[PDB]
Ligand binder design. Structure first.
Ligand SMILES: *[C@@H]1O[C@H](CO)[C@@H](O)[C@H](O)[C@H]1NC(C)=O
Ligand SMILES: *[C@@H]1O[C@H](CO)[C@@H](O)[C@H](O)[C@H]1NC(C)=O
Ligand SMILES: [Cu+2]
Ligand SMILES: [Cu+2]
Ligand SMILES: [Cu+2]
Ligand SMILES: [Cu+2]
Ligand SMILES: [Cu+2]
Ligand SMILES: [Cu+2]
Ligand SMILES: [Cu+2]
Ligand SMILES: [Cu+2]
Ligand SMILES: [Cu+2]
Ligand SMILES: [O-]
Ligand SMILES: [O-]
Lengths: 552, 552
């Protein structure tokens, strides 16, 4: 096991992801950030210096469990006080299992500004993958707005709310094209990009040699978009999802939601004298963004040899039945960990869009989360009972609530209480979607849990009932860290509370989390060790722990 | 009989149709143009002074037959030379029959710049309309872009073509809203408009008293948009179409393509305590323009009192079955003229989108029209045989043409020949639609005939074949001046060549006309009287009528 040490500085910089200049959050002058790669069992040490001028910053490592290091999860106001400008913090954690993971900002809307990058973990040294491939292609997907993140943030906190709107560009490994298309030759209504290939927004071309097999790693850190990935004329075999192996299956395209990572295998068994289109299109929302595009370049063909066909036409955004058909097919690889068969706690969380005091907010069982200035982990380790609400948040919603109609907003409150588990509890969480404030509208929401992987027991339509208990999959369910709820549907997940610390569980769409859509889960904090002083040095924790008497 | 004299000047002026300032082509300082209202049989005299600085102008009176006056049609290079800066021209014509008509620019792309308005002809003095209503409302629909007309024109003449795109705003009597919605109440994602009612872009509200019946006259002069008109909670009785009367029928909404006019009657039956939305949405093209909205305000309710329902959701743009369902119903009112049972001439016109010398053009039987600098009416009266191509244009296309494939463009050319008819021929025209340059695309095209009305004999899918004859409606076909071809279909029309002149027959979508999509018909030209000198004063007609010898 090696220690992988990184030394990084976060600073803003001018950059043009789609050849339109804006400011991006770079790490060591790079956008996207540097890739962390390690082997399972290695320690990763990142010393991060904050060089933003007035802003705090944190980095969350998505999918890493932080077992023994919950202070290193990178969630402002939950695991730590943010890092102040000019300060250096050490995140030191272990990577336990192989997978495609990534990292991102977890304070304000910092990840939409560009703070993200890949974190890949290979098998233990000497050990190999369950599947053979000759090469690897890594792809991080994100979306880009031309509006400032500070104007977006304020617009989302105003009465009337100013929605951020659909993204201007989809970014593939940080690059995309705006107001022109590299596929303009198939449609004269499109403007041709003039690009010699050297520009910041020039496509990241995938170069493959014929008759080989390639592992394509795909992760999504979109703030809003749900995307569909397809390569013209090539079958994808799904082999990994969220750092866990799935039972393999072929599909023509995959749907990927913010927070998910997949590894797909392809084989370059097609006509070797041509190049092929890679298309990443928007779904689950009425599209107003051009697809992200690049080429699968079979060497030695010039990359300027455009494909004979147009890019694959993206599946209709609202064919939720097609989407369920993909999603429901995901099962754990033969020989995976199977769930506990009985649960000790089952919690029901209704997802609504609400209007609390003029403001449009999202609520979970009528509580919109507002995070305190004291970090929950330090607050619970030093038993600071006034830092947040000690009263237990609701574990159920009313059986007379009608999920087919708008909220009344009669009892909708902002809050910051925490759900608490006993170390070793098996917990089921039934996520219930509902109609939003507009009539006859419900959307898809990706939910992500920190510090754990859970089994996805099932999905269904309408309101979950006792009649649905027997449909839950306890034989083969996949282990994941992100899961979707479909329009007016439910999703049931199970996990064991075996990881001392305070863990966020929230919709991974960034404006939704900003508007309150998430909860806080705490378990076994009595067993948490020493927290680094920098993670304690703010709020109520700095107040009790800094000894600064008066008259003494 | 009465002479209606108008003193008019056209000048560009600053104006903000959607509250974003640009320049608009106004008549006598107003946008839209002044309405003409006369009674059938009167004579309209318009003395137009061109107050543009470097540009010529012409005004076409849409749907007036120009019976006796072919020189007053207002088509530059067909009926007349354009009117020069500083000069006054007189358009004198008879309005023969009652109905909803309008006028517009017919030089370059001048109508998209705002040169258009209403021409309404009431029954002969003393007569009544065949139906009763207590009031009437006049609506003229058009569309609006934020880019300059002249930058658009250069974009459509460039290699590679820069397409104009979807309109920014749909205008209802010259007003519309951009980036905000007057119906933002129903959706948090929409921005509210901060309008007082006094602004240039504030909606023209429809004021009505309960329990009355009204005639809503609706005309379209859009450059591109096919629109769908609907009123919340109010069924429409269709009673007039293109100045003629149709067999009355009820509908919840009507489709209207560029160049058509309709009259619909409504009765204010609904609950008198509230207001209803009028919504005009985009169809036939993938929408990216918000609906044009206004209120049907039941007096004395406050106009600020929003309806209880959202606006009616426009039917899906691509549900062409629904469109055909509406279109195929229109039949002539009993008492109307029936067609000649036998025709003397049948012409087949294939509509293609092509690339001629790198330029994306539109062509009819492979000729893309480019108009000459000599007006066809002057050239033909004075028998100037070198002014245009005297070869008859193609009257049929190859029966082996695959209308499901992009054109090859092998023989597609630009030309300016004329189809000539004998004074009194019954002419049949089958307009055939086909696949465009993009694979699997065919669009709807509204075709308009000048100087005539025709009977719509029928519509069909695919390619026309002679075995299609038994479906043609020789019994009840409506009389119209504009008619659509649906994607991949044909439409057959019949008219009589009885009105001496040179008449344009083109697709009424302004960009397509700019790109060559139209033909020219001339009949009985040796029966034309004296043409105005200003209409002759350019090109070949000037050169040959100005006696200016040399040595002298
Ligand atoms: C993190 O790792 C560095 C480098 O080994 C070390 O100096 C530092 O004290 C560690 N801090 C924690 C909290 O483990
Ligand atoms: C048009 O009518 C006006 C008013 O009667 C007259 O002065 C003018 O000469 C007429 N011109 C033509 C071409 O008829
Ligand atoms: Cu994440
Ligand atoms: Cu995470
Ligand atoms: Cu759309
Ligand atoms: Cu969400
Ligand atoms: Cu998170
Ligand atoms: Cu017209
Ligand atoms: Cu006309
Ligand atoms: Cu057309
Ligand atoms: Cu015309
Ligand atoms: O995570
Ligand atoms: O006309």
């Amino acid at each position: 096991s090696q220690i992988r040490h990184y030394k990084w500085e976060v600073e803003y910089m001018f950059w043009a992801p789609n050849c339109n200049e804006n400011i991006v959050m770079g790490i060591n002058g790079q956008f996207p950030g540097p890739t962390i790669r390690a082997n399972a069992g290695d320690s990763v040490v990142v010393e991060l210096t904050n060089k933003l001028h007035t802003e705090g910053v944190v980095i969350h490592w998505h999918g890493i469990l932080q077992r023994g290091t919950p202070w290193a999860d990178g969630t402002a106001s939950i695991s730590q006080c943010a890092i102040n400008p000019g300060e250096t913090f050490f995140y030191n954690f272990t990577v336990d299992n192989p997978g495609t993971f990534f990292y991102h900002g977890h304070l304000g809307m910092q990840r939409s500004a560009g703070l993200y990058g890949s974190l890949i973990v290979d098998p233990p040294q000497g050990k190999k993958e369950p599947f053979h491939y000759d090469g690897e292609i890594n792809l991080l997907l994100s979306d880009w707005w031309h509006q400032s993140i500070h104007k977006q943030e304020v617009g989302l906190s105003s009465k009337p709310i100013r929605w951020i709107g659909e993204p201007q560009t989809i970014l593939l490994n940080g690059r995309g094209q705006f107001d022109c298309s590299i596929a303009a030759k198939y449609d004269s209504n499109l403007e041709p990009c003039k690009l010699k290939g050297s520009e910041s927004c020039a496509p990241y071309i995938f170069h493959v040699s014929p008759k080989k097999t390639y592992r394509i790693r795909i992760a999504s850190t979109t703030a809003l978009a749900a995307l569909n990935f397809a390569i013209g004329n090539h079958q994808l075999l799904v082999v990994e999802a969220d750092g866990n192996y799935v039972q393999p299956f072929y599909t023509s395209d995959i749907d990927i939601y913010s927070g998910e990572s997949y590894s797909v295998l392809i084989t370059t068994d097609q006509n070797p004298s041509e190049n092929y289109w890679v298309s990443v299109g928007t779904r689950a929302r009425h599209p107003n963004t051009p697809p992200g595009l690049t080429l699968l370049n079979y060497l030695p063909n010039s990359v300027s040899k455009l494909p004979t066909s147009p890019p694959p036409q993206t599946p209709a955004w609202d064919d939720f039945d097609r989407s369920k058909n993909f999603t429901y097919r995901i099962t754990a690889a033969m020989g995976s960990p199977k769930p506990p068969v009985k649960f000790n706690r089952r919690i029901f969380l209704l997802n609504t869009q609400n209007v609390i005091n003029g403001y449009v907010k999202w609520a979970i069982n009528d509580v919109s989360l507002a995070l305190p200035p004291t970090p929950y982990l330090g607050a619970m380790k030093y038993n600071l009972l006034h830092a947040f609400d000690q009263n237990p948040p609701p574990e159920v919603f009313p059986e007379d609530y009608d999920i087919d109609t708008p909220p009344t907003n009669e009892k909708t409150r902002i809050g910051n209480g925490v759900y608490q588990f006993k170390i070793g509890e098996v917990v089921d969480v039934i996520l219930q979607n509902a109609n939003m404030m507009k009539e006859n509208l419900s959307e898809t929401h990706p939910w992500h849990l920190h510090g754990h992987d859970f089994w996805v027991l099932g999905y269904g339509d309408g309101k979950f009932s006792a009649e649905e208990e027997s449909s839950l999959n306890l034989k083969n369910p996949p282990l994941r860290n992100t899961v979707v709820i479909f329009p007016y549907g439910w999703t049931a997940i199970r996990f064991v509370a075996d990881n001392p610390g305070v863990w966020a569980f929230h919709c991974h769409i960034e404006p939704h989390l900003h508007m309150g859509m998430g909860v806080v889960f705490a378990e076994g904090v009595e067993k948490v060790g020493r927290i680094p002083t920098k993670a304690l040095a703010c709020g109520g924790t700095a107040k009790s722990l800094i000894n600064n008497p008066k008259n003494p």
